[PDB]
Amino acid sequence: VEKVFFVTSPIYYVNAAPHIGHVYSTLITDVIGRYHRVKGERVFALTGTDEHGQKVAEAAKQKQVSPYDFTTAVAGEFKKCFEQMDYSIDYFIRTTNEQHKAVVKELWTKLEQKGDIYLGRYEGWYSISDESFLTPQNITDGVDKDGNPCKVSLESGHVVTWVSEENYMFRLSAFRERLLEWYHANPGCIVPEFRRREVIRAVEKGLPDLSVSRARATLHNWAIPVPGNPDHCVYVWLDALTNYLTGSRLRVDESGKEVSLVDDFNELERFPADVHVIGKDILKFHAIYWPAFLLSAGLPLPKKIVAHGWWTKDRKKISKSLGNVFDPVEKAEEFGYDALKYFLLRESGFSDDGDYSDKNMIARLNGELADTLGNLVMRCTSAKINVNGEWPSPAAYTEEDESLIQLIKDLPGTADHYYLIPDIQKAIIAVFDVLRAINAYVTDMAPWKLVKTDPERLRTVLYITLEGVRVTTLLLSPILPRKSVVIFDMLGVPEVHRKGIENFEFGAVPPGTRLGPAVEGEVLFSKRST
């Protein structure tokens, strides 16, 4: 099946300003999208905001403004933040959008016609802050914002409330067996593996039916009405997850505005998602509820859900109320955008709860970006080493030459696999393993000495080095989008050879290609003091 590769981020609640977790999640979405464009594939990358519900509506009452005005302002803050982060996201969706509402109503009606929705009751715990239903085994004792004793979530530590309401219920219990069939028939559909095992364990135990509406008063009427029943509003999560379907059905103009909603997802060839990027906090919604709603509605299921961990700064929680902030724009302005992106993507795998510190950020910038990559780019473009400012023609290869050539030839296949898991950390590590080898080759060959001593040999060493830099850079280009362009310019790589699987091949850029102009004081990654 050739289709549009469809990658998504979560849509974020707009109760508060955008912060590191949102930037991180959308970055991972963006990188995956960028990588597939570089392979020459059609790509649709989606992100946006989750704007209904009690959480958001009560956050707006606290600031004492209209919910329309509140959501519009905060959404604008998210949009501004993502523009500034310099992503290449194809569309930013808002659940307040009138076309999204239509899709939600259409899906609700499908589930109902299917016989999977009945009028019943939820009597149990609920976390407003997570918009999540919880069993008693998943709550514990704690203190509210006044220090009085209350109940809170084991998952998140937010205050839980007891809800007792007549609600429309989805027959999630009926989908246990099909969900298990699905997890087992597609054992790469949840990444990383231990989160996949977590989901299977939970569904093995059995599933209760799920409340998919609430009484309209409880929601302060800030939600989508249930079709045919004005007294109920649709569960914010059913509304929210539907953004993926909505997103798959929107024709978008050149300025990123939605101009049309198509009747059937097949028309745009995006649905279902090839990868849903999510944080571990919302696994159940994506890996249990979502596929159950799709099975009910007769819609195809996503190929992969990837769930990452949470960040800390200096081994402590990130918060404004506590004395520990982490502003990604400010850190990007301080250290550079591609560098900050590299760090967030290199420092932690999706299994781990990663940690930022200025110390570690600088060690990576200095060690990997500057000393390993930057150093190497300057050497092979240097007028002192590359006297003619060109890609030379190689003479015969020694076994050492070939050992390095083999590493460069094998790198794309290996990096490809890692990007497709996805495991962006391993992909980066694989590229830099090859960069380190190219450096050790250059040190071994000492091409500066060869300029006087063996210019024929220098041709070979210099050529292999240029091509190693080009290939490594091509594969890192989803990670370092701006800097890879600079590198390609310095190397003088023609535009055509900067994307496409054709240019994964060793030798795509011919000898005689001229290097780009050298600039007075340019340096690729500027080292920073410790």
Q: Does residue 289 belong to the site contacting ligand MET (CB under 6 A)?
A: no
Site string for ligand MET, 416-435 (x = CB under 6 A): --------------------
In the region spanning residues 215 to 254, those forming contacts with ligand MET, defined by CB under 6 A, are 240-241, 243
Name the helix (H) or strand (E) containing 5: strand 5-13
Q: Is 10 in the site for ligand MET (CB under 6 A)?
A: yes
Shortest Å, Cβ 519 to ligand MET: 44
What is the pattern of x (binds ligand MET, CB under 6 A) and - over residues 268-287?
--------------x-----
Query: CA 73, CA 71: separation in Å to the nearest integer?
Result: 5
* CB of 277 or CB of 474, closer to ligand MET: 277
CA distances from 322 to 62, 235, 315, 316 (A): 20, 32, 13, 10
Residue 13 as a binder of ligand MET (CB under 6 A): the answer is yes
Q: What is the largest CA-CA distance in the chain?
A: 87
Interacting positions 338-357 with ligand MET (CB under 6 A): none
Rounded least distance, CB 67 to ligand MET, Å: 15
Stretch of residues binding ligand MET (CB under 6 A), selected from 6-14, 138-146, 300-308, 396-404? 6-14
- Given a contact cutoff of 8 angstroms between Cβ atoms, the answer to whether 376 and 461 are in contact is no
CB nearer ligand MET, residue 38 or residue 282: 282
Judged by CB under 6 A, does residue 441 bind ligand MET? no
Nearer of residues 242 and 484 to ligand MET, judged by Cβ:
242
Nearer to ligand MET, 240 or 339 (CB): 240
The correct pick among 26, 36, 50, 392 for binding ligand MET (CB under 6 A) is 50
In the complex, minimum distance from the CB of residue 240 to ligand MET, in angstroms, rounded to a whole number = 4
Q: Which residues contact 16 (CB under 8 A, 6 or more apart)?
A: 59, 74
Q: Cβ of residue 237: shortest distance to ligand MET, in angstroms?
A: 7
Strand partners, 127: 132, 160
Q: Give the Cβ contact number of residue 222 at 10 Å.
A: 23
* Nearest distance in Å: CB 125, ligand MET: 18
Kindly state whether residue 368 participates in binding ligand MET, applying the rule CB under 6 A.
no
State how far the Cα of 237 lies from the Cα of 131, in Å rounded to an integer.
7
User: In sequence order, which residues have a C-beta less than 8 Å from that of residue 456 and are 6 or more positions away?
Assistant: 395
**Buried b / exposed e along 404-443 (16+ C-beta atoms within 10 A):** bbebbeebbebbbebbbbbbbbbbbebbbebbebbbebbe
**Nearest-angstrom CA–CA distance, 429 and 529:** 24
134 versus 241: smaller Cβ distance to ligand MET? 241
Using the minimum distance from each CB to ligand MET, give the nearer residue, 12 or 311. 12
The backbone region for 6, taken as left when phi is positive above 0, alpha when psi lies in -120 to 50, beta otherwise, is: beta
| Number of residues binding to ligand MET, judged by CB under 6 A | 9
**For residues 50 and 116, which CB has a smaller minimum distance to ligand MET in the complex?**
50
* C-alpha span between 321 and 323 (Å, rounded): 7
Closest-CB residue for ligand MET? 50
Task: Give counts: helices (H), strands (E), the chain.
Answer: 19, 19
With contacts defined by CB under 6 A, name the span among 7-15, 112-120, 214-222, 406-414 that binds ligand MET.
7-15
Residue type (1 letter), 451: V
Measured from the CB atom, the residue of 78 and 342 that comes closer to ligand MET is 78
Name the residues that contact ligand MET, by CB under 6 A.
10-13, 50, 240-241, 243, 282
